[PDB]
Amino acid sequence: YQPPYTITPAIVNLVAEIGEIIGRYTVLAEQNLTPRLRRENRIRTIQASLAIENNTLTLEQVTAVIDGKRVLGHPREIQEVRNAFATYEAMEDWDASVEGDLLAAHELLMRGLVDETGRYRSGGVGIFRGEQLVHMAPPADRVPKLMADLLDWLENTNEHPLVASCIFHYEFEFIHPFADGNGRMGRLWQTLILRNWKPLLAYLPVETVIRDRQEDYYRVLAVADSQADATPFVEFMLGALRDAVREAVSTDHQVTDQVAALIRAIGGGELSSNDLMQALGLSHRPTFRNNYLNPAMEDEWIERTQPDSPRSPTQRYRLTGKGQR
Structure with a gap:
């Protein structure tokens, strides 16, 4: 056959x-x-x-x-x-x-x-x-x-x-x-x-x-x-x-587990450094700036509410091209 x-x-x-x-x-x-x-x-x-x-x-x-x-x-x-x-x-x-x-x-x-x-x-x-x-x-x-x-x-x-x-x-x-x-x-x-x-x-x-x-x-x-x-x-x-x-x-x-937690913490609103610090449960400032805020800032995931004044005390952060799932 x-x-x-x-x-x-x-x-x-x-x-x-x-x-x-x-x-x-x-x-x-x-x-x-x-x-x-x-x-x-x-x-x-x-x-x-x-x-x-x-x-x-x-x-x-x-x-x-x-x-x-x-x-x-x-x-x-x-x-x-x-x-x-x-x-x-x-x-x-x-x-x-x-x-x-x-x-x-x-x-x-x-x-x-x-x-x-x-x-x-x-x-x-x-x-x-x-x-x-x-x-x-x-x-x-x-x-x-x-x-x-x-x-x-x-x-x-x-x-x-x-x-x-x-x-x-x-x-x-x-x-x-x-x-x-x-x-x-x-x-x-x-x-x-x-x-x-x-x-x-x-x-x-x-x-x-x-x-x-x-x-x-x-x-x-x-x-x-x-x-x-x-x-x-x-x-x-x-x-x-x-x-x-x-x-x-x-x-x-792809985003790091540190950078992914920051994007979810911002959401729709505008969060300051202390607002993210409290949400992420952090207590060491150099760790937040180096492992969370700057990495998300460099790869263009987050932008500043005051871009004209980079070193501002009332500085807050809002998402750009951030897609959830």
């Missing part, structure tokens, strides 16, 4: 470019990706992946759900987000070729939403490709062998993870092994195959590109299905991944 994998000069050029872009995306650009940035990307991945399957929640809403903040919306859509966030955070446990790990993921993703969770469908299911005509997936009794072969292929494939993830996505979408959430499981397992190669790709929000190119995504996926060839789909996905890892590097191209 082997899926219709046929290479093309366009694929090798996309692999070359993705490879090179990651060659930069790593280096010291990994020492810039903070936990908040990983989360921002993860929230974008979840919101877009769910948006493709007609979830009406906005990025601002999905952020608030995962943050724990106030959320007004449908309880079923909000639980889709909670389950999705829970599922992506458990990727470290799974190997993309393990059938048990695939079922454990489907369980976390569909828990409390559907009857058949963590197992393949017992009956038939319709394949939806946007506003395209619905057709039936393979019979449920064919799924176990189809999935066994696909997962065996993925374990012993010589293809590069970038290509292998696209081939699996294409084959998985054709089979639709679960009663629900096949679309979301497809994007999840593609992210898993990529993070099993480079774990930084787990925070690549390629789903925002697939959501914006949704009409073409389903059209290329249908044309590839009609012509029985994964090649055009692999070109599309490697293209989307390239554009994603490219907009990830373009986003790239």
Whole structure:
């Protein structure tokens, strides 16, 4: 068994470019990706992946759900987000070729939403490709062998993870092994195959590109299905991944704990040296001037209320370009 994998000069050029872009995306650009940035990307991945399957929640809403903040919306859509966030955070446990790990993921993703969770469908299911005509997936009794072969292929494939993830996505979408959430499981397992190669790709929000190119995504996926060839789909996905890892590097191209405490102490009002001294809980004047007032003054975080008289007794201080969080 082997899926219709046929290479093309366009694929090798996309692999070359993705490879090179990651060659930069790593280096010291990994020492810039903070936990908040990983989360921002993860929230974008979840919101877009769910948006493709007609979830009406906005990025601002999905952020608030995962943050724990106030959320007004449908309880079923909000639980889709909670389950999705829970599922992506458990990727470290799974190997993309393990059938048990695939079922454990489907369980976390569909828990409390559907009857058949963590197992393949017992009956038939319709394949939806946007506003395209619905057709039936393979019979449920064919799924176990189809999935066994696909997962065996993925374990012993010589293809590069970038290509292998696209081939699996294409084959998985054709089979639709679960009663629900096949679309979301497809994007999840593609992210898993990529993070099993480079774990930084787990925070690549390629789903925002697939959501914006949704009409073409389903059209290329249908044309590839009609012509029985994964090649055009692999070109599309490697293209989307390239554009994603490219907009990830373009986003790239700090205050001390002492300076950060002074900026928060000023706020909106105008504080004098003794007003800051009392607020910061300081008692040594040279320490305040050298470690707090002058550092914030030099890096242009704070300005003087009386700039004409620098050595003034009634001297007070107000913020300039100071952004909170």
